[PDB]
Amino acid sequence: TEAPKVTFKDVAGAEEAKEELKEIVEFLKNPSRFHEMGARIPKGVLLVGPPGVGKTHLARAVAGEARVPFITASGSDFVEMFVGVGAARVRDLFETAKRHAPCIVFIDEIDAVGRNDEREQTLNQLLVEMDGFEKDTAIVVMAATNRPDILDPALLRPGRFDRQIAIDAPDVKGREQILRIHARGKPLAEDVDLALLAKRTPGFVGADLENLLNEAALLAAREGRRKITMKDLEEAAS
């Protein structure tokens, strides 16, 4: 019931995405206004971009910026459940979401569902739940993927995820943020400059930054060293 603490001011980069999401935010902040105005918002937004680019974080920031609940679920989990259970769970998800107007329902790993009885049954239920939305339903469904081209076309038809928003690799601030988060718990030498590390890793995604630190940690750990140095980070980079 408590909206996330994360807001747009906490999201580095994604400047274009934020612009395109302004409309969703304003709707979530005052759904009654858009209803009375007879306006019409998507209700289905797909964030497109590579893994470790901050897609989930941004979606959470939308709920935070609008100070509205952020209800999460995983397409992966749904499909892992017994045949029919994933569908039943999809059903439970939207029934619960409807008791919290307005809100954001975020389906993680939509690829698992949109890309086998389990998957199909889960997908058909999601399709039905989305078509089941009335123009008055104060719900915005968000999802994320990097391969929108191999996604079941049905998920992109009008009334569903008919709004896509590109999310590129993190900018220098995004990378620094990712690096600082993953550096927690790792002993760094005084000469370690995470800000410089971010500047010198343009194009890197969350996974690369994570393996860079882990690989630096392993080197220092293997050589029996007590602290990770800037050189270790530079060596682990490639």
Annotated binding site for ATP: 12, 52-57
Cβ 101 to Hg ion shortest distance, Å: 5
Q: How far apart are CA 215 and CA 76, in angstroms?
A: 28
Q: Which of 6, 139, 143, 183 binds Hg ion (CB under 5 A)?
A: 139
Tell whether residue 142 is a contact of Hg ion (CB under 5 A): no
Q: Which is nearer to Hg ion, 91 or 100 (CB)?
A: 100
Give the residue closest to Hg ion by C-beta: 103
In the numeric block, the tokens 């045949």 are attached to: 83
Residue 147: count other Cβ atoms within 10 Å of its Cβ: 11
Tell whether residue 197 is a contact of Hg ion (CB under 5 A): no
CA-wise closest residue to 75 among 110, 104, 46: 110
Spatial contact of 209 and 54, defined as CB atoms under 8 Å apart = no
Q: How far apart are CA 191 and CA 189, in angstroms?
A: 5
Q: How far apart are CA 179 and CA 197, in angstroms?
A: 8
Q: How far apart are CA 149 and CA 29, in angstroms?
A: 32
Q: Which is nearer to Hg ion, 147 or 180 (CB)?
A: 180
Residue 234: count other Cβ atoms within 10 Å of its Cβ: 14
Q: Identify which range of 12-20, 96-104, 161-169, 194-202 contacts Hg ion by CB under 5 A.
A: 96-104
Q: Identify which range of 126-134, 168-176, 199-207, 220-228 contacts Hg ion by CB under 5 A.
A: 199-207
Q: Identify which range of 36-44, 72-80, 89-97, 191-199 contacts Hg ion by CB under 5 A.
A: 89-97
Tell whether residue 54 is a contact of Hg ion (CB under 5 A): no
Q: Which of 46, 53, 61, 103 binds Hg ion (CB under 5 A)?
A: 103
- Interface residues with Hg ion (CB under 5 A)? 97, 100-101, 103, 139, 178, 206
